[PDB]
Design a protein around this ligand. Structure first.
Ligand SMILES: Nc1cc(F)ccc1C(=O)O
Lengths: 359, 358
C-alpha cells in the first residue's frame, strides 16, 4: 500500500521474471530505494525481517540472472540510488584525481592503488582524494573513522593527499552488507564502489575493472555518474583491475573535450615486465611498512628493476599523464621518481596523517 | 555436513553460469539440501535469515532460467519432495485421481472433489482423490484420521477416498513460509498433482493454469506416473479444470506420444455458464450445495443449473478417460445415473462412515 513496501519490491521482481524482462534502469533505481528503506527499518528477529531478506534476495538474484546489472544505464541508476543514503561532502566553490578498482578479479597484488595515489599526491599541481575500501592507511597511526562528510572540508584546503573509507560515507552499502554476505553470489553492489565518490570536486579518475566484458559498459556508466570528468577505465589482460606489471592493459578513455581505447605495456614506461608472484601483498601492516620505510623513504630507484617499486611508478605515471592531458608515459615516470626521492610523496602522506590526528 | 548452506550455494552458482550447469538430478539433490536446512529454521535467528536468503536466491534463479518449466526438472522436484512424504504401502476396477495445479487466479467451485465423488458411484470406477477435504472436512469427517497407516484399512471397501495433502507431504510444510514470503511462482506451485501417495492409481485428470506449461507438464506426469493414462487439461479462459465456458484443451498421455483434442460444453449436451455462475461459495457452503443441491438429486440434466452442469461435465470426462473412449454424452448418462440412483451419495457416505470408525 505505501510505496516503500514488500508489495512494491515484489512488483519490481515480477518485472524481472517476465519474458523479456520489463525492469527499466529507472525501475532499478526505484527498487533499490525500496530495498534500502525496507532494510534500514528492519525489526530484528521479526517475521517481517525474514520476509524482507527473502524478497531482497529474490530481487538481487533475478537481477544477476538477467545480467541487466552489467548494463551501463542500470549500473548508473544503481549508484545514484545508493548515493541517496550517502553523506556527500559539501565544499566551498590543481587537478583533483581518484584511483580505484571494482575488485572481483581474484588477484592479491600489492596495494599499488593507495601507493600510486600517495606518490602522485607528491607531484606539484596534483591533488589526490582517493576513495576506497583500506586497512593500509589504518596501520600508519591515523583513525580513518575520524574522516567523514563533516571533517573532509576541514582536511581539504591544506592536504595534497586524502583517503576516504567508503563505509564512513555510504550508509546504503552498510544496509545491504549482511544480505550480501548471506547471498554469497556477486550482485550489482560488487561494481558500485568506484562510482560512489562523495566529493563532487574530483576532476579525473582511474577506475579499474575486473573483466574486459564489463569495461565498455563501466566506461558508459562512469560518464553518466561523473559527467565531464576525464576518466580512464583500465583492465590488465592477465585479469586485473589496474595497470598490470605483466603483459598489456586496455584503457577506455572518457574524454569530455572529444569511445577511444589504447594499449599499455611496461616497455612504454621504460620498465621491465614483472610476474604477479613478484608483486604480491604481504597484508596491510607489512604493505604499509614497505611503502613507508622502503618505497617512500627512497630505498629504490628507477632502473633497479625492483618489481613493487616499478609497479607503483607505472600506476603513478598513468595518474600524472591523465592529469596533464598527454600520453608521455616516460615523463610521468620521471615525475613519480622525483615525488619519491625529493621526499615530497612521504611529506604529502605524513601531512594527511598529522591532519587526521588533529580532528 | 554436506546438507549445508555452502552446498546449497554451490548449486545456486551452477544456475548463474552461462549457460546454466544445474542438471535435473542437481535440482533433486539441491531440494533435499533446502528441505533439510528449512527444517532447522524454527526461529528468526540470523542463521534463519541466512538460510532464507540462500533458498530464495536458489528458487528465484531457477524460475528466471525457466529450468522449472522443463519436465525432467519438475519430475526430479516431485521425487525430492516425496522423500519427505508418508507414502502408502498397498498389497499388490480403474483407479482415478482428478486435481489441478491451481495458480490461475480463479475462484471456481470445488468441481474436482464433487466430480470424484460422482465418478465413484459409477460401477467399475474407484476414486482416490488427492488434494489441499476442507470441503469433506465440514461433512463431519476427521480428515487427520486419513494417513499412510489408515489408507490400506479404508482401501478394500471404499469406491471413494479423499487424501488431504498436508497430512502426507511434510516437505511442502517446510517451504510453506518461504513460498508465502517469496510472493513469486516457483517449481513448488506445480508439484501438488504429482505427489499422490498411492502408486496403484492408474488414470488421472491434472489441470494446469497455463497453455505454455501443459506440454512439459504432460511429460513430467509421464515421468512421475509411468504406469498411468493421464489427461492434462487447460480451459482457455485460464482455468485448471474442464471449463463450463469456452474451450478446454486436453493433452493425452496414452502409455501404449502427446495426443491433443478439445472439449466444449455443447459436446456434453450442456449450455455454457460464465465462471461467475460457478463461483466457490467457500468450503462450508460448497459442501452444503454438493450434498443438499447436487447429491440429493434436486437438479437434473436439462435444469441448466451451473454448478450441477459443471460437476456432470468433469465427471463425464473422468468416465470417458476410465473407459478409453470419447463418448462424452455416455459420460453424462453415467454421471446422471450415479447421482439419481443415490449410488454417489452412498459412496461418499460409506467413506465418511469408514473414517468415523477408524
Ligand atoms: N502446501 C501444500 C501442501 C501439500 F501437501 C501439497 C501442495 C501444497 C501447495 O502449496 O500447493
Amino acid at each position: 500500500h505505501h510505496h516503500m513496501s514488500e508489495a512494491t519490491l515484489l512488483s519490481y521482481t515480477k518485472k524481472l521474471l517476465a519474458s523479456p524482462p520489463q525492469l527499466s534502469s529507472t525501475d532499478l533505481h526505484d527498487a533499490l530505494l525500496v530495498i534500502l528503506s525496507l532494510l534500514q527499518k528492519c525489526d530484528t528477529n521479526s517475521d517481517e525481517s525474514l520476509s524482507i531478506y527473502t524478497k531482497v534476495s529474490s530481487f538481487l538474484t533475478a537481477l544477476r540472472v538477467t545480467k541487466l546489472d552489467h548494463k551501463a544505464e542500470y549500473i548508473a541508476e544503481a549508484a545514484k540510488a545508493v548515493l541517496r543514503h550517502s553523506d556527500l561532502v559539501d565544499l566551498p566553490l590543481p587537478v583533483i584525481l581518484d584511483i580505484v578498482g571494482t575488485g572481483g578479479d581474484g588477484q592479491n597484488t600489492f596495494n599499488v592503488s593507495t601507493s600510486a595515489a600517495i606518490v602522485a599526491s607528491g607531484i606539484q599541481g596534483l591533488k589526490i582524494c582517493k576513495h576506497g575500501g583500506g586497512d593500509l592507511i589504518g596501520t600508519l597511526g591515523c583513525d580513518m573513522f575520524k574522516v567523514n562528510s563533516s571533517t573532509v572540508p576541514k582536511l581539504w584546503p591544506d592536504n595534497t593527499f586524502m583517503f576516504l573509507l567508503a563505509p564512513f560515507f555510504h550508509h546504503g552499502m552498510g544496509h545491504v552488507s549482511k544480505i550480501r554476505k548471506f547471498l554469497g553470489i556477486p550482485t550489482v553492489f560488487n561494481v558500485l564502489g568506484p562510482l560512489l565518490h562523495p566529493v563532487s570536486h574530483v576532476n579525473k579518475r582511474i577506475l579499474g575493472v575486473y573483466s574486459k566484458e564489463l569495461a565498455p559498459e563501466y566506461a558508459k556508466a562512469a560518464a553518466l555518474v561523473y559527467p565531464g570528468s576525464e576518466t580512464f577505465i583500465v583492465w590488465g589482460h592477465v585479469g586485473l583491475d589496474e595497470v598490470s606489471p605483466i603483459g598489456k592493459t586496455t584503457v577506455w578513455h572518457i574524454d569530455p573535450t572529444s569511445l577511444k581505447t589504447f594499449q599499455l605495456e611496461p616497455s612504454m614506461f621504460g620498465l621491465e615486465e614483472h610476474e604477479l608472484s613478484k608483486c604480491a601483498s604481504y597484508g596491510p601492516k607489512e604493505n604499509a611498512r614497505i611503502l613507508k620505510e622502503e618505497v617512500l623513504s627512497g630505498k629504490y630507484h628507477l632502473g633497479d628493476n625492483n618489481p613493487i617499486y616499478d609497479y607503483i611508478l607505472m600506476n603513478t605515471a598513468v595518474l600524472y599523464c591523465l592529469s596533464q592531458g598527454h600520453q608521455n608515459w616516460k615523463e610521468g615516470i620521471i615525475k613519480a621518481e622525483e615525488s619519491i626521492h625529493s621526499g615530497n610523496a612521504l611529506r604529502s602522506l605524513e601531512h594527511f596523517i598529522d591532519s587526521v590526528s588533529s580532528l
